[PDB]
C-alpha cells in the first residue's frame, strides 16, 4: 500500500542528485556544465555525472510499481538518455 | 418519429422498473427467479441479467442530462445486485476456500441463495449448485460495470476474495460442472460433465479480470487480480477441444450464444465461430424460440414433475417436443447489433414479435419457454415445428422470466441504438477483425492469423564448469552468479512466492493452490521484493520425474515447449524461455543430441519456432514485468528469500525376478551384498522397504532415502532399469500425467491405467491428481510396482504426441495404456527375431518415445499384414468415421450385430444415442471388448468396414436375421484355406497365419473373401426394391 522505505530514502538520494545535479541539466540540449564559472559541456564528467542520475533511476525503477516511481524512474533514465543523446 | 430521447427511455423505464426492478431484493439486492409465488430462490445467473439489464438503462440514461435521477437509480441498482452476489460468495468463503484446493460438485459455490437473506437454501443433494457459468459471469460482468464507471468493489477485503473467485475458475478445465442449465446432460442423471458453456466463460472472465484493478479509477496496485495464464491456457485448449460441441452428451446447445456471443464472445478463431453459430441455429432454432439442446425434457409434457431424474430411455420420447427459448432470439440480436448485420437483428425482432407477451400495462413480457400442449405432442413429433405451442410465462398471472426480461431491455437498446454494444462491453469482449495487440484474447502484435512469435531463449548453464567448456564448442551461456542481480528460480519457488496472493486470514482464504507453474507463466518476468526473477520451465526440474533425465526427451521437451508458447503465447511482451543445461546432459554420448539443439537455438530456428539467444540482461531490458505486489502490501518485506538456482562449485540382469523372489529364504540382504548390478539393488531395497518397513535403517542409511539415492543416482549413469523401480517403489508421480489424462478425453478419448490382462480403470472424466495417484498405484498394478512407472511413461508420451500430432491417433478411441505397452511390447518381439529381444525397461525414455511412434504410424511400411493387423489391432484402431459406418450397419440390420457373445441391437441402441453422438462409439468396443486376439480385431473391423461398404453402395440389400460376424469372419475364412490348399496345400488347420498375412487388396486379399462373406449372406435376403434408382428390369 504505501511505498517501500527504499524508495522513501531515494526521495531523500533524489533530492541529492536534483539539487546537485540534474538541476544544473540544459533543458534544450540534455548536457551539463562544469560549474558557474565553466558553462561548457565536458564529455567525460557528463558521462560520469550522470551515472548518479543513471543508478538512481536504476533502483527507482527496481521498485516502480506506482505512477509517480515509474515517473520519476521514467524521468531519471530519460534524463540519463538527454544526456547522452546530446553527447 | 419527432419523440424526444426522454420519451423514449422513459418507455424502458417503466418496463424495468415494473417487470425486473420492482422485484429486486430490498435486502439482498437479489432477483428472485419466481415473482409469483413467493420462492425465496435466487439464481446467479438470472440476478446477473437482471443487473445488466438496469445497467443498461443506466448507459442508456447516460446520454440524458437531465435523467432525474435515474441514472444512479439504474447504475446503483445493478450495484446493489452485483453486491448481493458478493454477500452470498463471501459468506460462503469456507466454501471458496475448499473449492480452491479440491473442486468437486460437494465443495463448490451455491448457485441458488435466498432472495430475501443470501443464506444457502438448497443443499448439493437436492440441487446441482456445481454452475462454473454463475461464477465466470459474475467475474465478467464485475469488469464490465466497473469498467462502465460502476463502484462495486469496495476494498481490498474483497478483492482478496475477487481473486479467490479467480483461483476457482482457474482449474476448472478439469472440474465437470452441471452447467448452465443446472442439469449436466440430457440424461438427468445428475452426473457432473464439462460444458464448452462453463469452460468458455471462465476463459471470458480470466481474460477481462487478468490485470484489472477492482477499483476503477480510483484504484492501485494492490487491487489488481492476477490470473494464471496457463490455467485460463488450459481453460481455452478445453474449449477450442469441446467445440463445437457443448459437452460430451451434446453436440449443440442454446448455452453457446451466451458463450461465443454476448455477454463472454468466448471464441476467437472465426473458422469455430461460424461452426458453432450454425449448430446452434440449424439444430436448436425454432419458430418460437431456441431450444436449450436436442432431447431436452425441461418442463415438457412428456416429463414426470415429480421425479428429479430422467431415465436412461426417456430422452428417447424428448426429440421434437423440447422446449423452445425465446431468449435467444434476444441473445442473436445482441450477437446481430455487436457484429453490425443488421439484417440479424431485423430478423430475430420479427421473431421475437410474435413471441412477446405483455402485461395489463402494455409492457413487454419475454416468456421462459414455449412447450408443445399434453395434446400435440405426438403431432408435433412427426411435422416439428408445425403446431401452436403455449407460452410458460405470459404476463399478467405474476409469473415474470426475469433473465429474459432483462435481457430484451439490453437488445431492444442496443437495436434502437441507444446504448452501443462498446457500452455494454467497456473491456473488449466482442472485437471485430481487427484482431491484433488484446492480451490473453489471442490477438498478439501479429495478429489473428500470422504467428512467427519469437522467443527469447536464455542460454543459462549450472556450472562454470560446464559454461566454460560449453563456451570451447561454440555455445554462448551464462551461469546464475553471472547473470546475477537477476534471480533464476524453480517454478515451485514462484509458486511459494504466489501462495500469498489472495490471502484473507478474516475470511479464512489461503491464497494460490500449490499448483505448478507451467512454460507460459515462467516465460513471464517477474519483479518480487524489488528482486526481478525468471523461472526456467518446469522441464528443467530433476524433481517431478526421470525422462526430464532422458537427454533426447529434454531436447524434443525443449522443442515442444517453444512450439507450446509459438502457439499458446498471447501478450504484449517477448516470451522468455531459459534453457537450463545440467553436466548430466553433457557427459556421456548426450553431448552430440544437445549441442545440435543448442546450435539450432544459436541459429535462430528450431523445431520451426523462430527464438532470439541473447543474454538475460538483454531479454529482460524493456519486457513488461508482473509486479507481484500481493507480497509486499502485506509488508512481508522480510519474508525468506525464496532459494535461487545455486551455481554449482553394464550387462542384461543375471538376478531374473522369479529366481529370487521364489526364493523363500532371507539370506537375500547377504544376496544384495553379494551382486553388484544396480537393478538387483533396485529390487533389493525395494523388498526392504516392504519386507522390512517403510523406514528400516541400511548401510548408507534409512531405507526411505537410500532408495532416493539410487534413483537419484542411477539417472545419473543412465541405467534405465534402476531408475524405473527407483521411481515405480517410492510411488512417484510427476505433476504432468492428471492434465495429460484431462487432455485425453477432452478429445473424445477414453483413457484405461493398466497393464494388460489384469485390472483396467477407464478415465471417463477428469480426475484431480490425487485420485489418479490413487488409481495408477494401488488399485490398478499389483503384480509390478514398474507397471505404473511405464504406465505413467507413456501417459506424459501421449501427452507429447496427441498435440504434435493429433491425426496419429484418429481412429484410436480408447487410448489403453498396458494395451499400448503390450503394442510396443509385443513389437520388441517382433523386432527381437529369434534373440532374446529387448525389454521395454531396458530402453531409453526417448526409445520408448520412438518406438512407440514407430508403433503407431498411419501404416507401418512393409510389415507382414499379420503383423500390422497386430500394430493396429493391439492399439484397437479403427479407421476414420468407423463408427459412423456401424449406425449405417445397424440402421440396416434390423436384429442387429453379434460377435464374440457381444451382442449390439437395432434397439434401444438406434433410438437412445445420435450418430454422430460419442456413446454409440464406446457401445461399439464394448461390444468388440471380447475379441482376445488383435489380429482377430482387426479382421472384424476390417469387415465391419467392408459390410459398411456393401450396404452403403448397394441400399437394396438387408439383412434379415442377427449378423454374427464371426461366422462371416469363419465363412471367408474356410474359402481362403480351399483357395490355398488348391495352390499349396497348406496343411495348418484352424491357423490364421496364411489369412492374416495377404494384403486386403489384391488378387485374391481379405477384404475379398470378406466382401464374398456378407454377400453370400447378404443375398440370402429379400431385396426391397429402392426408389433412388428404380430397376431398369
Redesign the interface.
Known amino acids: 500500500?504505501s511505498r517501500?522505505?527504499?524508495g522513501v530514502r531515494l526521495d531523500g538520494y533524489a533530492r541529492l542528485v536534483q539539487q546537485t545535479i540534474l538541476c544544473h541539466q540544459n533543458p534544450v540540449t540534455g548536457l551539463l556544465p562544469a560549474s558557474y564559472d565553466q558553462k561548457d559541456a565536458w564529455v567525460r564528467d557528463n558521462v560520469y555525472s550522470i551515472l548518479a542520475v543513471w543508478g538512481l533511476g536504476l533502483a527507482y525503477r527496481?521498485?516502480a510499481?506506482?505512477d509517480e516511481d515509474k515517473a520519476k524512474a521514467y524521468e531519471l533514465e530519460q534524463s540519463v538518455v538527454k544526456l547522452m543523446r546530446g553527447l | 418519429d419527432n419523440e424526444t430521447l426522454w420519451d423514449k427511455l422513459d418507455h424502458y423505464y417503466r418496463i424495468v422498473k415494473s417487470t425486473l426492478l420492482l422485484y429486486q431484493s430490498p435486502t439482498t439486492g437479489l432477483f428472485p427467479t419466481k415473482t409469483c409465488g413467493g420462492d425465496q430462490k435466487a439464481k446467479i445467473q438470472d440476478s446477473l441479467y437482471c443487473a445488466a439489464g438496469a445497467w443498461a438503462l443506466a448507459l442508456a440514461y447516460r446520454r440524458i442530462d437531465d435523467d432525474k435521477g435515474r441514472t444512479h437509480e439504474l447504475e446503483h441498482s445493478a450495484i446493489k445486485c452485483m453486491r448481493g452476489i458478493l454477500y452470498c460468495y463471501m459468506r460462503q468463503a469456507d466454501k471458496v476456500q475448499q473449492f480452491k484446493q479440491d473442486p468437486r460438485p460437494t465443495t463448490c459455490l451455491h448457485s441458488v441463495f435466498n432472495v430475501h437473506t443470501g443464506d444457502e437454501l438448497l443443499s448439493y443433494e437436492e440441487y446441482g449448485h456445481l454452475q462454473i457459468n454463475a461464477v465466470s459471469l459474475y467475474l465478467l460482468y464485475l469488469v464490465e460495470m466497473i469498467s462502465s464507471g460502476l463502484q462495486i468493489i469496495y476494498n481490498t477485503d474483497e478483492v482478496s476474495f475477487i481473486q479467490n473467485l479467480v483461483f476457482c475458475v482457474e482449474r476448472v478445465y478439469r472440474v465437470p460442472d452441471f452447467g448452465v442449465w443446472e442439469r449436466g446432460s440430457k440424461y438427468n442423471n445428475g452426473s457432473t460433465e464439462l460444458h464448452s458453456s462453463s469452460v468458455g466463460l471462465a476463459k471470458a472472465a480470466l481474460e477481462a479480470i487478468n490485470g484489472f484493478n477492482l477499483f476503477g479509477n480510483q484504484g492501485?496496485?494492490?487491487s489488481v487480480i492476477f490470473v494464471d495464464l496457463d490455467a485460463h491456457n488450459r481453460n481455452r485448449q478445453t474449449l477450442c477441444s469441446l467445440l463445437p460441441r457443448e459437452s460430451r452428451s451434446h453436440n449443440t446447445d442454446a448455452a453457446l450464444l451466451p458463450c461465443i456471443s454476448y455477454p463472454a464472445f468466448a471464441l476467437d478463431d472465426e473458422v469455430l465461430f461460424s461452426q458453432t453459430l450454425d449448430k446452434v441455429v440449424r439444430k436448436l432454432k425454432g419458430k418460437y424460440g431456441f431450444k436449450r439442446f436436442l432431447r431436452d425434457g425441461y418442463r415438457t409434457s412428456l416429463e414426470d414433475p415429480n421425479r428429479c431424474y430422467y431415465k436412461p430411455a426417456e430422452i428417447k420420447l424428448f426429440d421434437g417436443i423440447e422446449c423452445e427459448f425465446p431468449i435467444f432470439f434476444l441473445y442473436m440480436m445482441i450477437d446481430g447489433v455487436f457484429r453490425g448485420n443488421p439484417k440479424q437483428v431485423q430478423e430475430y425482432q420479427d421473431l421475437l414479435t410474435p413471441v412477446l407477451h405483455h402485461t395489463t400495462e402494455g409492457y413487454p413480457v419475454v416468456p421462459k419457454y414455449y412447450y408443445v400442449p399434453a395434446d400435440f405432442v405426438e403431432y408435433e413429433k412427426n411435422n416439428p415445428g408445425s403446431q401452436k405451442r403455449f407460452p410458460s410465462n405470459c404476463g399478467r398471472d405474476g409469473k415474470l422470466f426475469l433473465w429474459g426480461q432483462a435481457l430484451y431491455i439490453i437488445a431492444k437498446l442496443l437495436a434502437d441504438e441507444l446504448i452501443s454494444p462498446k457500452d455494454i462491453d467497456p473491456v473488449q469482449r466482442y472485437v471485430p477483425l481487427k484482431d491484433q495487440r488484446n492480451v490473453s484474447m489471442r490477438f498478439s502484435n501479429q495478429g489473428p492469423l500470422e504467428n512467427d512469435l519469437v522467443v527469447h531463449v536464455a542460454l543459462i548453464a549450472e556450472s562454470q564448469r560446464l559454461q566454460v567448456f560449453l563456451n570451447t564448442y561454440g555455445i554462448q551461456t551464462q551461469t546464475p552468479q553471472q547473470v546475477e542481480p537477476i534471480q533464476i528460480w524453480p517454478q515451485q519457488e514462484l509458486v511459494k512466492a504466489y501462495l500469498q496472493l489472495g490471502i484473507n486470514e478474516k475470511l479464512g482464504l489461503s491464497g494460490r493452490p500449490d499448483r505448478p507453474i507451467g512454460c507460459l507463466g515462467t516465460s513471464k518476468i517477474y519483479?518480487i521484493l524489488?528482486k526481478?526473477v525468471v523461472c526456467y520451465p518446469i522441464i528443467f526440474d530433476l524433481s517431478d520425474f526421470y525422462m526430464s533425465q532422458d537427454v533426447f526427451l529434454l531436447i524434443d521437451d525443449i522443442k515442444n515447449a517453444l512450439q507450446f508458447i509459438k502457439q499458446y503465447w498471447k501478450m504484449h511482451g517477448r516470451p522468455l524461455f531459459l534453457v537450463l543445461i545440467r553436466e548430466d546432459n553433457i557427459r556421456g554420448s548426450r553431448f552430440n543430441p544437445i549441442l545440435d539443439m543448442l546450435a539450432a537455438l544459436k541459429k535462430g530456428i528450431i523445431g520451426g519456432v523462430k527464438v532470439h539467444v541473447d543474454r538475460l540482461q538483454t531479454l529482460i531490458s524493456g519486457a513488461v514485468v508482473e509486479?507481484l505486489?500481493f507480497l509486499?502490501?502485506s509488508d512481508t518485506?522480510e519474508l525468506p528469500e525464496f532459494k535461487s538456482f545455486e551455481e554449482l562449485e553394464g550387462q542384461q540382469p543375471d538376478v531374473n525376478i522369479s529366481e529370487w523372489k521364489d526364493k523363500p529364504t532371507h539370506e537375500i540382504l547377504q544376496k544384495l551384498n553379494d551382486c553388484s548390478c544396480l537393478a538387483s539393488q533396485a529390487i533389493l531395497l525395494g523388498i526392504l522397504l516392504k519386507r522390512e518397513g517403510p523406514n528400516f535403517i541400511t548401510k548408507e542409511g534409512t531405507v526411505s532415502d537410500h532408495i532416493e539415492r539410487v534413483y537419484r543416482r542411477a539417472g545419473s549413469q543412465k541405467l534405465w532399469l534402476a531408475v524405473r523401480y527407483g521411481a515405480a517403489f517410492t510411488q512417484k508421480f510427476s505433476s504432468s500425467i492428471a492434465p495429460h489424462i484431462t487432455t485425453f478425453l477432452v478429445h473424445g478419448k477414453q483413457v484405461t491405467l493398466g497393464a494388460f490382462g489384469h485390472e483396467e480403470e477407464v478415465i471417463s472424466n477428469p480426475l484431480s491428481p490425487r485420485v489418479i495417484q490413487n488409481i495408477i498405484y494401488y488399485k490398478c498394478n499389483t503384480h509390478d510396482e514398474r507397471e505404473a512407472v511405464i504406465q505413467q511413461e507413456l501417459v506424459i508420451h501421449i501427452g507429447w504426441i496427441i498435440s504434435n500430432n493429433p491425426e496419429l491417433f484418429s481412429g484410436m478411441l480408447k487410448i489403453r495404456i498396458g494395451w499400448i505397452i503390450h503394442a510396443m511390447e509385443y513389437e520388441l518381439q517382433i523386432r527381437g527375431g529369434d534373440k532374446p529381444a529387448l525389454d521395454l525397461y531396458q530402453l531409453s525414455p526417448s526409445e520408448v518415445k520412438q518406438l512407440l511412434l514407430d508403433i503407431l504410424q498411419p501404416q507401418q511400411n512393409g510389415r507382414c499384414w499379420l503383423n500390422r493387423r497386430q500394430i493396429d489391432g493391439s492399439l484397437n484402431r479403427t479407421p476414420t468415421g468407423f463408427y459412423d459406418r456401424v449406425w449405417q450397419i445397424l440402421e440396416r440390420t434390423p436384429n442387429g450385430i453379434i460377435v464374440a457373445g457381444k451382442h449390439l441391437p437395432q434397439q434401444p441402441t438406434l433410438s437412445d444415442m445420435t450418430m454422430y453422438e460419442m456413446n454409440f462409439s464406446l457401445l461399439v468396443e464394448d461390444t468388440l471388448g471380447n475379441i482376445d486376439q488383435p489380429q482377430y480385431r482387426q479382421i472384424v473391423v476390417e469387415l465391419l468396414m467392408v459390410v459398411s461398404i456393401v450396404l452403403e453402395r448397394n441400399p437394396e440389400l438387408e439383412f434379415q436375421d442377427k449378423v454374427d460376424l464371426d461366422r462371416l469372419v469363419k465363412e471367408a475364412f474356410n474359402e481362403f484355406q480351399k483357395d490355398q490348399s488348391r495352390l499349396k496345400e497348406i496343411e495348418k488347420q484352424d491357423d490364421m497365419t496364411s489369412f492374416y498375412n495377404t494384403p486386403p487388396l489384391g488378387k485374391r486379399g481379405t477384404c475379398s473373401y470378406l466382401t464374398k462373406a456378407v454377400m453370400n449372406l447378404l443375398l440370402e435376403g429379400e431385396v426391397k426394391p429402392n426408389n433412388d434408382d428404380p430397376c431398369l428390369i
Request: net charge positive.
Open positions: 500500500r517501500s522505505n527504499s527496481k521498485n510499481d506506482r | 492501485c496496485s494492490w519483479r524489488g526481478t509486479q505486489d509486499r502490501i518485506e
